[PDB]
């Protein structure tokens, strides 16, 4: 299509789809109940992403939002994806360290607020207010990163993989509010095609890279 | 109303409503925790359907989608219903065979993708792309039917009822992508009033017929 | 803003936000798994409300609905809030009395129907039909209040707090259908600024007042 960002959407669609099939094939025959949980979640997440990348590529998950007296192309389909895939990724971490239910509920809830307020900010027509939603969303993220960092005698296999995945999460998830802030949803200092490229690298890493790391460890088996 | 399909929407509303009250009255006094689970789920599903059938009948859950240079009446309220009722129906099956959590998550997730992509296809304005979403949705269905068929020492009561309900599911759920494909959302070979009739027969059978079968068995009691 | 109701939206935003921070600080250091559950839920609920009150205050969660040949300002963001916060409040009650899963599913499901049909009624352009949805929603509420009242050897600490919270719920939740009926969504006998004031008092009481009562009791600790 005309959209210069189409290539990264196409590339993203392809990588999420290939990752989904890879994880699909890999989890064939798994019988341990616990490992079954992890395979399901690490397969499901890129499958969801695949469908939302495809909707962006085909133009379905795109809308125009007026602000700054301009018509800004806003890919809303990303929030539909993240609404489901970021709590699932947090579930991966929680199952790992066998987090208490109370804590899981806190994380999932903070995470819904994070994506929900990001969506509202993405769709808000008063320019100044967009950043108010960005700030509240960011606070929710910080809450999450805090709990993953200061809320957690587990087998050394668990601890070792958790620490890695936890560091991956903090680094990758922290870049999203920055990309949004500088990209077309925020200050618009970075054009949409480079922003889409950034999100594509982050998403594949956060979903497929993260899943490859998770599924290579024995911490997932009972 | 003018809509020739109104009669099947009215009939559907009436049957889902009557079924809901029947199951409501039937589950009065149930005290076994396990049977309590099944009654809740088989009552809830037609109650949801009732509300979405009523919204279609009153015109609320209907929208026009441009494609093929025409204005196509698309009942979106069906996906709102199915989004909640098809995972609940799969939960009925999973509780039955006491499925592992990992597997339940896989089914619910595949099922959300199934209905979500069906909705996107239903609302897509580029005619060709509608069938791409139909295909992805169909693949998700096939995944589900596979797991219900090849992923499952349970009491012979369980196995016997499961097998019946499993065969009911495969037969009825498999007809939906065909109806959509030939009906107004797809190729438009079948007019909307006959399509609405088809979906009404499928839905009542899949919800009320299925629930009557489930609740007649002793497999639901501990 | 011009909207006379802005003050109650501002006040509501402020009270939900202050309550969220209060509960946030209060649950610091909690380590009992059970109490952890309650803190999460009573903190999450006002945090959600905060974001939806802010969206109403900034104008995002407001839409105009034609009916009675007028353009009626409808705050849809309330249903987005209630969709998540009313089942969470019911979860508080269920955890308390250690309700069976079957029953929890029934309550959450009835509750989704309650808010979902209230939303449909809120957005319905045929005046007469709005009250049909109000009636179905009200029936769902009555179902819920029934189960909380007639569906429940627990420690006397549990029973004592449950009874209080149960009476709070019945009184406060019962006022919502009345406010809606007499307010701008229904008969329009009460102007929108007084209606917003009513909902603000109900919401803070149902979320912050309710949470303060819940967290003062020892029934929440194992
Ligand atoms: C829990 C725990 C935490 C709860 C967090 C509280 C915050 C909730 C706020 C939410 C509000 C949603 C806003 C949106 C639905 C309203 C759509 O209106 C748009 C903006 O006026 C219209 O623009 C154009 C429309 C654009 C399209 C938007 C699509 C989006 C939908 C993504 C959700 C998915 C649902 C899966 C459906 C199948
Ligand atoms: C934000 C706080 C941290 C949290 C509290 C939330 C409330 C405050 C929201 C931020 C807010 C004002 C930013 C206002 C930008 C302001 C310079 C707009 C100036 O007017 C310009 C011309 O009329 C807008 O045109 C368009 C010019 C654009 C190119 C300028 C982009 C604006 C930038 C805003 C960046 C805010 C991020 C720092 C916050 C980083 C922390
Ligand atoms: C943007 C990327 C960083 C690019 C830099 C290239 C790699 C840099 C790695 C960053 C980090 C990884 C550090 C290694 C880790 C190892 C820590 O293990 C510790 C042992 O208990 C864990 O506790 C304590 C762990 C502590 C670790 C906290 C991680 C830091 C978080 C980095 C912020 C994020 C990125 C900010 C966004 C930016 C891209 C705009
Ligand atoms: C999980 C696990 C799996 C996740 C699956 C990934 C796929 C997610 C895709 C979803 C995207 C939803 C699309 C839709 C919300 C966007 C609405 O915009 C329409 C099409 O441009 C506008 O046309 C006219 C609008 C029409 C109205 C559409 C209504 C529908 C809403 C049904 C959902 C219900 C929510 C209950 C609310 C109370
Ligand atoms: C589909 C694959 C199995 C999965 C891969 C998904 C990508 C392919 C999507 C299918 C796609 C082209 C079908 C294209 C229909 C094509 C004949 C359109 C021809 O142009 C016509 C006039 O311009 C369209 O008018 C309107 C004419 C309409 C009356 C014709 C209806 C089209 C039919 C499409 C049927 C596809 C189903 C076979 C797939 C069954 C498997
Ligand atoms: C089989 C596997 C996917 C097949 C790959 C094909 C990709 C299509 O190539 C281009 C046409 O030359 C797509 O642009 C054509 C313009 C449009 C783009 C459509 C390409 C995507 C719709 C295809 C993405 C995967 C599809 C998924 C079909 C369902 C799946 C379950 C088999
Ligand atoms: C459209 C309907 C079929 C109308 C036909 C009228 C009744 C036909 C029954 C279809 C089927 C039922 C067969 C009986 C079953 C009994 C199988 O029990 C087996 C014992 O282990 C289960 O394992 C193995 C079980 C295997 C059974 C697989 C079921 C088949 C699936 C049928 C496809 C669907 C319908 C295709 C849609 C069509 C309507 C366009
Ligand atoms: C379960 C168990 C029980 C299921 C209950 C069955 C009843 C389900 C019905 C639901 C249907 C939702 C209606 C709505 C999504 C359709 C939007 O269209 C509006 C009315 O035509 C357009 O007006 C203007 C649009 C207005 C905006 C509406 C926003 C609302 C969205 C609130 C949901 C939130 C989702 C969190 C997203 C992040
Ligand atoms: C409702 C039953 C209990 C449950 C069954 C649901 C189906 C019935 C829905 C109620 C319905 C007719 C109410 C119809 C109101 C009727 C007086 C409208 C008269 O026409 C007026 C001028 O054309 C409407 O203008 C506007 C005039 C407005 C100011 C009048 C407001 C209408 C009021 C409706 C109140 C219904 C509540 C009693 C139900 C309390 C129980
Ligand atoms: C009591 C039970 C339902 C009563 C049945 C009545 C059905 C209405 O008959 C027709 C008027 O002659 C409806 O068309 C009138 C035009 C419009 C159609 C409205 C009919 C539906 C709105 C009624 C469907 C059931 C209602 C649910 C009221 C709430 C329920 C919880 C009691
Ligand atoms: C509108 C408010 C009531 C304003 C009135 C000011 C305080 C009045 C309190 C109302 C009620 C509280 C009664 C005390 C309670 C104590 C009951 O304890 C019992 C011991 O087992 C619980 O079983 C049995 C418990 C039984 C209690 C049922 C509660 C009643 C429900 C009241 C209806 C609601 C309000 C109707 C809405 C109105 C505002 C339009
Ligand atoms: C066999 C294994 C290792 C995995 C196969 C699954 C295939 C799909 C995608 C593989 C790539 C992901 C690796 C994670 C890390 C990265 C930072 C990815 C950034 C993406 C950019 C494009 C790079 C090239 C690729 C096409 C693999
Ligand atoms: C007492 C029992 C058996 C159930 C009572 C609940 C009432 C509601 C609906 C009953 C019908 C459902 C039977 C399932 C099978 C079918 C294939 C249904 C197809 C629907 C078409 C209309 C048929 C007539 C009816 C009004 C029952
Ligand atoms: C320290 C404790 C008690 C709580 C602090 C949290 C602060 C936030 C809100 C506190 C108010 C809620 C009490 C519940 C009961 C009421 C009926 C509230 C009705 C609201 C109307 C405004 C009243 C004044 C207030 C600003 C507290
Ligand atoms: C699968 C993709 C992942 C892991 C996406 C993560 C996304 C975030 C952490 C997004 C965060 C945001 C905020 C903190 C600020 C507002 C905007 C968002 C939604 C981009
Ligand atoms: C309560 C009703 C039930 C059991 C509905 C089942 C619906 C399906 C299995 C729908 C499947 C679809 C696809 C496989 C293809 C695309 C279109 C759908 C959504 C009709
Ligand atoms: C956090 C706020 C709470 C506890 C809100 C409770 C809301 C209700 C009980 C709403 C009920 C409604 C009906 C019974 C009738 C139709 C309209 C509603 C949605 C206001």
Short mmCIF file of N, CA, C and O and ligand atoms in Angstrom, two decimals, chain A residues 50 54 58, chain B residues 129 132 135-136 139, ligand 6:
data_model
loop_
_atom_site.label_atom_id
_atom_site.label_comp_id
_atom_site.label_asym_id
_atom_site.label_seq_id
_atom_site.Cartn_x
_atom_site.Cartn_y
_atom_site.Cartn_z
N UNK A 50 -0.22 -11.75 15.81
CA UNK A 50 -0.33 -12.03 14.38
C UNK A 50 -1.62 -11.43 13.84
O UNK A 50 -1.64 -10.77 12.79
N UNK A 54 -1.85 -8.36 11.29
CA UNK A 54 -2.51 -8.47 9.99
C UNK A 54 -3.60 -7.41 9.83
O UNK A 54 -3.77 -6.85 8.74
N UNK A 58 -3.71 -4.75 6.69
CA UNK A 58 -4.85 -4.65 5.79
C UNK A 58 -5.62 -3.34 5.94
O UNK A 58 -6.50 -3.06 5.13
N UNK B 129 -10.61 -9.40 1.43
CA UNK B 129 -10.06 -9.60 2.78
C UNK B 129 -11.03 -10.28 3.74
O UNK B 129 -10.57 -10.95 4.67
N UNK B 132 -10.16 -13.73 3.99
CA UNK B 132 -8.91 -14.02 4.69
C UNK B 132 -9.20 -14.18 6.18
O UNK B 132 -8.68 -15.11 6.80
N UNK B 135 -10.88 -17.50 6.90
CA UNK B 135 -9.92 -18.59 6.89
C UNK B 135 -9.14 -18.70 8.19
O UNK B 135 -8.95 -19.80 8.72
N UNK B 136 -8.68 -17.55 8.70
CA UNK B 136 -7.96 -17.60 9.98
C UNK B 136 -8.89 -18.05 11.10
O UNK B 136 -8.54 -18.88 11.94
N UNK B 139 -9.36 -21.71 10.82
CA UNK B 139 -8.22 -22.44 11.36
C UNK B 139 -8.31 -22.52 12.88
O UNK B 139 -8.03 -23.58 13.45
C1 LIG D 6 -0.46 -20.23 3.77
C2 LIG D 6 0.40 -19.32 4.67
C3 LIG D 6 0.21 -17.85 4.24
C4 LIG D 6 0.45 -17.75 2.72
C5 LIG D 6 1.38 -16.55 2.42
C6 LIG D 6 0.71 -15.71 1.32
C7 LIG D 6 1.08 -14.22 1.50
C8 LIG D 6 0.43 -13.39 0.38
O1 LIG D 6 1.41 -12.83 -0.53
C9 LIG D 6 1.01 -11.54 -1.08
C10 LIG D 6 0.33 -11.79 -2.45
O2 LIG D 6 1.53 -11.99 -3.41
C11 LIG D 6 0.01 -10.92 -0.10
O3 LIG D 6 -0.37 -9.59 -0.56
C12 LIG D 6 -1.71 -9.56 -1.13
C13 LIG D 6 -2.52 -8.32 -0.70
C14 LIG D 6 -3.29 -8.62 0.60
C15 LIG D 6 -2.30 -9.26 1.58
C16 LIG D 6 -2.83 -10.61 2.09
C17 LIG D 6 -1.66 -11.43 2.70
C18 LIG D 6 -2.14 -11.98 4.05
C19 LIG D 6 -3.67 -11.87 4.05
C20 LIG D 6 -1.73 -13.44 4.24
C21 LIG D 6 -1.26 -13.61 5.69
C22 LIG D 6 -1.54 -15.04 6.18
C23 LIG D 6 -2.95 -15.48 5.76
C24 LIG D 6 -3.60 -16.37 6.83
C25 LIG D 6 -4.73 -17.36 5.98
C26 LIG D 6 -5.30 -18.25 7.09
C27 LIG D 6 -4.30 -19.20 7.73
C28 LIG D 6 -4.90 -19.88 8.98
C29 LIG D 6 -3.86 -20.31 6.75
#
